[PDB]
RNA sequence: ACGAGAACAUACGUUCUUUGAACCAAGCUUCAACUCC
């Protein structure tokens, strides 16, 4: 389902952690382990 | 047996007349009712 135009945004319907945040800038790996530690280490 | 004796510096009279504590000025700026399992 991408890319259609693409004019798509996520409105806050419980769309997810990575929808609400911004820090998948600017690589796949270090940001994934960063928020991995950040949310699911302290919980 | 005094340059002395007697003699209110007194009477009358509004600190009073006219005068906006005013003029200008957004309770506003930035925010996802949300994340996780």
Automatic annotation (TrEMBL):
Entry superkingdom: Bacteria
Family: Belongs to the CRISPR-associated Csm5 family.
Main function: This subunit might be involved in maturation of a crRNA intermediate to its mature form.
Protein name per its UniProtKB record: CRISPR system Cms protein Csm5
Gene this protein is translated from: csm5
Full-protein residues shown: 260 to 302 of 353
């Amino acid at each position: 389902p991408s890319q259609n135009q693409g004019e798509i945004i996520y409105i806050g319907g419980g769309a997810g952690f990575v929808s609400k945040t911004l820090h998948y800038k600017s690589k796949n790996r270090d940001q994934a382990r960063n928020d991995s530690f950040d949310i699911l280490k302290q919980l």
